[PDB]
Assembly symmetry: C3
Homo-oligomer: 248 residues x 3
Amino acid sequence: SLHPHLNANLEGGVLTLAINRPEAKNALYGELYLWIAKALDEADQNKDVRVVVLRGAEHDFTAGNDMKDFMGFVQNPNAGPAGQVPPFVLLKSAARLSKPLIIAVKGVAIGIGVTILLQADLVFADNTALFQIPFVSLGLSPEGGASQLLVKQAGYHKAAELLFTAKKFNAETALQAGLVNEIVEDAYATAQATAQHLTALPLASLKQTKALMKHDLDQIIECIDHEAEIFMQRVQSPEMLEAVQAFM
Amino acid sequence: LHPHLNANLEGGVLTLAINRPEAKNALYGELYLWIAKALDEADQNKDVRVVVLRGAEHDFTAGNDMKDFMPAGQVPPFVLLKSAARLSKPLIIAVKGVAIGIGVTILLQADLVFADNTALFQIPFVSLGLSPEGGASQLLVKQAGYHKAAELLFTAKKFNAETALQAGLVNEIVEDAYATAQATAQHLTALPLASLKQTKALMKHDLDQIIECIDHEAEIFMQRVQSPEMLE
Amino acid sequence: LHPHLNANLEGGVLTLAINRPEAKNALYGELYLWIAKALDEADQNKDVRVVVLRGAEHDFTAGNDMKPAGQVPPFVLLKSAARLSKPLIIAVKGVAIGIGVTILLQADLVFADNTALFQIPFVSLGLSPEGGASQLLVKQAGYHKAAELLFTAKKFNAETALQAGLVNEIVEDAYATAQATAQHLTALPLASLKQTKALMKHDLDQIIECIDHEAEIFMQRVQSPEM
């Protein structure tokens, strides 16, 4: 389906999904998380798509959860299963994509801008990238399976430093922690050349290799869901509501 | 009290400083047990938000007192390791000078570790005719990767702060280890308590299995303790 | 004893050296089986305390010679290396292709020089992982780097291997470093090394199961149109 703030282009088996909400530096709201999730789900069924590239359209990847949206949410929270709240739907859609998923990062990549990297196979950034996992300082808790995936990808000590302190960090830190594969001059051209190289390789080899690497997908999904339950406890906490009420 | 352990609580930060400079903070039975009890009670004390563990002066710990040296899960060093692993609040370690044996394996229970360029690390267990402690045979493989963990465990070599940093034992090498630790501790005491507690509990979802690895290692260790290798 | 494989024991160090330089140490069926058997015997050999495995003067192995899945020879070698109860050290120079990389994941220590040229080419042949790589490389290098090396089938150098944890140290003389390290380890208590390694590889049966699972998939692909 066509929707604002998300451009899709398919050429030579490469599907490029580009977040395009510059007025807000690509902050994500409820329905945009779902539109991105649906596009991933449809790409995986589309026989003309072999590789997906997800990035921003321009100078930023994502400023994270839209704060205006978030404050309306805290005052009227989704009462359904925590795992069906929009950001967890996107993160699971990404985790389950059977085809290679490449992400290219410029500028801000905050919250979900970091945890979605843990669902991608390859990540390229340039030196303008500025990352943060702000969940602790917002009064929230991990999402995207990061309590387990970031410990595995970065090592326990580094994962605890980025999660506990909630600090901003640069591309060299993200590269040392294994969140980014390489820092390059043109993140978007590199992501596109890599995607073209992958479409020239056998689809079945790629699909099977990825399926073996992700043999524990069911447990990853379980981790995302159980995190989501704890995350909603924090979203619904009395202290969160008072703080939003004041702010508003 | 016990003059070998300075404890101090300020602004939510409890600072535990091993103070036995005559023996380079080498540790002996009852002292393992007091540090363990202090960590246990820290977790129960609502005025305590973050613990920092370090040496008082130029050294972290020379490891087990060879004099002191001379149910396996209840032998003192293992008691301290489990109390560290169980602490539900953030635990920061700051390393200067020697950090030997349990001086390294205790770092695998800490959430954040800071060191300066004087730090000198070693896991001598293999060369003492012994075996791993502190869950190192799983925790160090996970933290450093298998190849590097094998290098540190098998060879029993001393290594410096840059090697520890690359293996993920140390978060950052800084000019003033104790000041950096205190500043991080104060930053963490200013953040929401339930957010830090639930984040740590998720990260340590496999705590039961860490305790079982520490206890399994303990049984093996205590057997090696009564072996000709050890004597030689 | 067997064509293209040298073996030397001294001071408790067994050095096995692949010796087929005219072919850049490309491996064929029988040769896989001889290396694997030598590892099986070294483990039963009371006078062996540490094993070094290496290639020829300039190269480790160009990989599988172009010219029950669990019993196909490269998988037998991969499992023999994984089961070896004593320390295994590999020293890498020049080419290290396919098996040349996946065997590093079964060694305890790996030393290379800057001539090393690594590749995992299976995807570009329409095949699939081997060596238990789909799990062991993810654990050793992290998921992103393992994906990069496995999906793209790119050739890569010693610095990239060091960053991926595949290599412990890049050194000037990989054979001398491997020998000095092995001599240090033979001087230490075999009982301590044995028991430390067995704890580190507590999940050995899971490792072997992954190797065999990959093997069955691999052998299907071998009959694919892509291949």
